[PDB]
Ligand binder design. Structure first.
Ligand code: SDS
Ligand code: SDS
Ligand code: SDS
Length: 60
């Protein structure tokens, strides 16, 4: 699986154990994400802090 980095223009193949891409952002500023990468478990979303998780090459 390939996932995009903070700057979508760049990416990397996920290591063993992390089969999900994620994008972290504040609900009021969806176009200004704060974190992107590979992860093993989709972080829990809250009222203001959301996480987008998917497993399609560079889907984050
Ligand atoms: C002085 C305040 C700092 C503002 C930070 C501006 C956000 C740019 C960081 C790239 C995040 C990714 O964004 S993306 O548009 O490329 O997907
Ligand atoms: C998301 C954090 C980026 C770390 C910046 C370190 C720069 C060194 C480049 C390593 C390339 C090799 O690594 S790779 O993970 O891209 O395959
Ligand atoms: C999880 C739902 C996926 C549906 C995609 C809809 C995009 C949601 C962005 C909110 C718009 C608001 O933000 S604004 O920055 O444009 O004002």
């Amino acid at each position: 699986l390939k996932c995009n980095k903070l700057v979508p223009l760049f990416y990397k193949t996920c290591p063993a154990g992390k089969n999900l891409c994620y994008k972290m952002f504040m609900v009021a500023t969806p176009k200004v994400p704060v974190k992107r990468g590979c992860i093993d478990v989709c972080p829990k979303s809250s009222l203001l802090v959301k996480y987008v998780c998917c497993n399609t090459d560079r889907c984050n």
